[PDB]
Design a binder for these strands. Structure first.
Lengths: 129, 84, 150, 363
RNA sequence: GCUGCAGUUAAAAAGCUCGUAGUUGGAUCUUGUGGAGGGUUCCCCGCCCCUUGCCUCUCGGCGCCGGCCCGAAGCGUUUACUUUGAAAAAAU
RNA sequence: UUUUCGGAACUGAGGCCAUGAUUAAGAGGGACGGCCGGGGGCAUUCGUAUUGCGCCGCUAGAGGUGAAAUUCUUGGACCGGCGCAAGACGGACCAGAGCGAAAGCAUUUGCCAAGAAUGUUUUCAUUAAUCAAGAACGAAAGUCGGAGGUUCGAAGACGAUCAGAUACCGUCGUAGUUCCGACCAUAAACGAUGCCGACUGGCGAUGCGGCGGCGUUAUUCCCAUGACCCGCCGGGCAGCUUC
């Protein structure tokens, strides 16, 4: 059965980007998916997006610009502390110059570079580059 | 499907072709209609996929028979859909 | 997919987006409740009341005319039964196969299908016992089962 | 082996199989006929089996699969036998099954919602059968022997509906049962000049004069009694397309059964033409039918001016065959309808009620 | 082989189905204008509807010409998580 | 000594709150409707054929092999005809077709209980997925106790072949092969490929249910419905093609 909705949303975008398609449809929608998409959009990796109301959790249509190399999920939501975050970005990123880990923290869902300014740890959600 | 068709504006002939649960937003294919018969003329309401053998207020023995799809009327004077 | 078969068919209802009552409907909330109270005296279960009302009257969804689901409407007048709809129909099915096997002990398919019904009775009673619809001491028994539906 | 297997479960197990595709159609009559036959026993066979005596005659009409087809003569015989077999039991006792409760003998069928309106099923079962006799008479060639052999039932429908007077319990005679004496006049409103004088010029003093005879010798006086008494009760219905129709049959009484003036009287009191132009074609039949008699009776009195004044309206076009409902699908370059034609072929008057067109044109 | 292996043919998926413990489990329930540090909207005060969410005492100092105010306390449905204090032999 | 007044608790009438139920899953269960299939159990019924027996016809061979021989036959084999008996099996139609958890499942008709998919503006409302322990079913061969015994045939007795032939080829034949009641738990038990869920090209067919449509054909005179033809949607056993 469907054990996790965020893993479907990112696998569906990742298969559409590799085929060269200009749009994709995500279903079901969730509060976690809308907050994750917003972090990719603010850094310039995807275009703007629209939500459809249907009285059953809803759907999203997203616009693609061709810049995204990958996006993905770490399935157990492991806890991270500021001293251990270096080991995770050494494992998951392609260079020290670009790409982002996404964390959930009591100050909000955010970019791993913002978590250092806000002096906060959290749980891992995923990444993009 | 080409590489660039937009997903937010399907034409009504693209939407009417596909299954009721797989449309952009869901909608039934069934409907309500008003039905009338000879000999007694009090008009009555029926559902197009009925399971019941309907008897009218005019007390005729069968208004319609049930079936594996739409129910069939006993040559009644109306099959007119209600608009909403 | 189905819980005890290899099939994975898709058939189900699909409600419209618009929850409102239509302007042509002549019925009103308390007259719909009285029709529900009359149909309950005939021994009709909640699933049968909704098809009689959909087929022969204007009400497509009783919950949209009257603000309540129809098992609640019967319970608030004490008209609803004690043993619920689906658990009654599952127990009624298991006693029919047991009346077959007493004279047809070679029917090894009927022996196999009885394991798949009684394990589906156990799964549904375990759910109702945690939500206080049934006593904690409630138990299905192969000797007692005929007395549950009399 | 036991009475309450028979009168409840052995009934309801078959009586629900009315319209389903898996139905035997013949056995729905015959197994109710067995339940009426297996009725020798006390506290059943004098009484409550009347429920199956109702539901069996309801089941006779449905052997014919659809409403537009006519009943076959070989089954139609049983309807005229079995409606009388029901009515002749209404003589025996003043007390009710299949309606109100008065005595509680081994049944309680008064659990029905507003249960007295079940008793009106006797009226609908005869009204549903009077209308079906017209469907027999439209569907045999009038130029043949079979038509005259089927007119031999036109007295028998009257012999049934005339019985709905001496044996009647509804609320007295004045709630809504009065339908049966509009159905009464629908077999006398047309009856012609020779027949209307059978007690008046054919020997009036020679016939028998007891109360047994005087019920018939009232003749056309019943056709003014049933013009006047129940207008107050027919004023119950708001349906203009039923309310207006009666007067245009009633004038046809006076026009043949009395003086020509008494027909123009009830017409020019009533001013119905603009109303029947709002009403539907099967009411308009009576307006055009009656207005031509107001002209034919003017010629029969010799007043050639008022004969011309009345007849010229119908004679303003070659429409008389389409006003009878029997027009050709083509007879010029005009005719282009086909969806509506089969509705009017179902909605026209039978042969023997036609007034002759060579006579009309000569007059 | 947790990060990080493999199971059509090289070694390897129980003949098949049910099922208690174990592991895993769908959507949903409060936001934008104003000021400081910084930018050209967002992180601290105070607000559309609630900003410690309530509350009114009494043993106990404050502000002023008794009464009314502002720091404790009852405490915010219970935990994991995270960030910060305290307290932990030396040698290595 | 008694009230007052505070603390604890059983209990009655009464007006206030917008007085209190999130949705309805392209998750699952249950009802309902018309169909569908070599799916299972019990009874019933038909067809030739193979072997045996009775009676009639005619004359010298018949069987079997790469070639032979064992075997059968003038109280008559093989061949032709008519009729009777017993036990086993369901050809052709029969297909990359259907049904079942798998093992497996094909003459007629009736009876008993069960089921997938589809249709649905029915109902409950998270009841679910996968599984140590434990449990049901499980080809053929084999073991124990009854009944039957047509055909075929491990062991065995013989004829050939050959250096030998305890084999391949031929004639005969025990156990078994069929039914009833208990055991047994294995297989190249195979798609040599766990189950549940999401996404990613094109094309023509095929079985089941539903939806739409111009004609042809059948029954009654239309209508409805069956056989055919042109499209669409579910879910099924498969095929061709592509950087």
């Amino acid at each position: 059965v469907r054990m996790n909705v965020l893993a479907d949303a990112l696998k569906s975008i990742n298969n559409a980007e590799k085929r060269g398609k200009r749009q994709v449809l995500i279903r079901p929608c969730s509060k976690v998916i809308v907050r994750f998409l917003t972090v990719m959009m603010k850094h310039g990796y995807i275009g703007e997006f629209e939500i459809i109301d249907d009285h059953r959790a809803g759907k999203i249509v997203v616009n693609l610009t061709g810049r995204l190399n990958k996006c993905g999920v770490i399935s157990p939501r492991f806890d991270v502390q500021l001293k251990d975050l270096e080991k995770w970005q050494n494992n998951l990123l392609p260079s020290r110059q670009f790409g982002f880990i996404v964390l959930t923290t009591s100050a909000g869902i955010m970019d791993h570079e913002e978590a250092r300014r806000k002096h906060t740890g959290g749980k891992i959600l995923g990444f993009f580059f | 499907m080409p590489l660039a068709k937009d997903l937010l504006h399907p034409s009504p002939e693209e939407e009417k072709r596909k299954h009721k649960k797989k449309r952009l937003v869901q909608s039934p294919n069934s409907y309500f209609m008003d039905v009338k018969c000879p000999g007694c003329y009090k008009i009555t309401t029926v559902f197009s996929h009925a399971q019941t053998v309907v008897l009218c207020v005019g007390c005729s023995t069968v208004l319609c028979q049930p079936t594996g799809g739409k129910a069939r009327l006993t040559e009644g004077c109306s099959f007119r859909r209600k608009q909403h | 997919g189905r819980m005890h078969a290899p099939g994975k068919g898709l058939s189900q209802s699909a409600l419209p987006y618009r929850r409102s009552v239509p302007t042509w409907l002549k019925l009103t909330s308390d007259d719909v409740k009285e029709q529900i109270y009359k149909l309950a005296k005939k021994g009709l279960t909640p699933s049968q009341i909704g098809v009689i009302l959909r087929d022969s009257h204007g009400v497509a969804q009783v919950r949209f005319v009257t603000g309540n689901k129809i098992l609640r409407i019967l319970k608030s007048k004490g008209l609803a039964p004690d043993l619920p709809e689906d658990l009654y129909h599952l127990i009624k099915k298991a006693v029919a196969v047991r009346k077959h096997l007493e004279r047809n002990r070679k029917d090894k398919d009927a022996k196999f299908r009885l394991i798949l019904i009684e394990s589906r009775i156990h799964r549904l009673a375990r759910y109702y016992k945690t939500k206080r619809v049934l006593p904690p001491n409630w138990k299905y028994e192969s000797s007692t089962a005929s007395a549950l539906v009399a | 082996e036991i009475t309450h297997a028979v009168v409840i479960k052995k009934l309801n197990e078959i009586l629900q199989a009315r319209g389903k595709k898996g139905t035997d159609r013949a056995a729905q009559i015959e197994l109710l006929q067995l339940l009426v036959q297996i009725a020798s026993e006390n506290n059943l066979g004098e009484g409550v089996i009347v429920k199956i005596k109702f539901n069996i005659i309801a089941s006779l009409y449905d052997y014919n699969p659809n409403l537009a087809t006519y009943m076959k003569p070989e089954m139609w015989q049983k309807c005229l036998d079995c409606i009388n077999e029901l009515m002749d039991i209404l003589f025996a006792n003043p007390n009710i099954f299949v309606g109100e409760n008065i005595l509680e003998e081994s049944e309680n069928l008064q659990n029905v919602d507003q249960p007295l309106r079940v008793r009106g099923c006797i009226l609908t079962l005869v009204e549903r059968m009077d209308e079906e006799f017209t469907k027999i008479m439209q569907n045999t060639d009038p130029h043949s022997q079979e038509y005259v052999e089927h007119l031999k039932d036109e007295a028998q429908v009257c012999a049934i509906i005339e019985r709905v007077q001496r044996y009647l319990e509804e609320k007295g005679t004045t709630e809504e049962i009065c339908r049966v004496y509009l159905r009464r006049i629908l077999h006398t409103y047309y009856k012609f000049d020779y027949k209307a004088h059978q007690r008046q010029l054919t020997p009036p003093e020679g016939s028998s004069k007891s109360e047994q005879d005087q019920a018939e010798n009232e003749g056309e006086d019943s056709a003014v009694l049933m013009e006047r008494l129940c207008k107050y009760i027919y004023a119950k219905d708001r349906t203009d397309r039923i309310r207006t129709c009666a007067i245009l049959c009633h004038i046809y009484h006076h026009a043949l059964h009395s003086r020509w003036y008494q027909a123009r009287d009830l017409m020019l009191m009533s001013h119905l033409q603009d109303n029947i132009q709002h009403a539907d074609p099967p009411v308009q039949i009576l307006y055009n039918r009656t207005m031509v008699q107001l002209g034919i009776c003017a010629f029969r009195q010799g007043l050639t001016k008022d004969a011309h004044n009345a007849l010229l309206d119908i004679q303003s076009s070659g429409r008389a065959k389409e006003l009878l409902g029997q027009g050709l699908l083509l007879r010029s370059l005009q005719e282009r309808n086909q969806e509506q034609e089969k509705v009017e072929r179902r909605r026209q008057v039978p042969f023997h009620l036609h007034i002759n067109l060579e006579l009309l044109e000569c007059v």
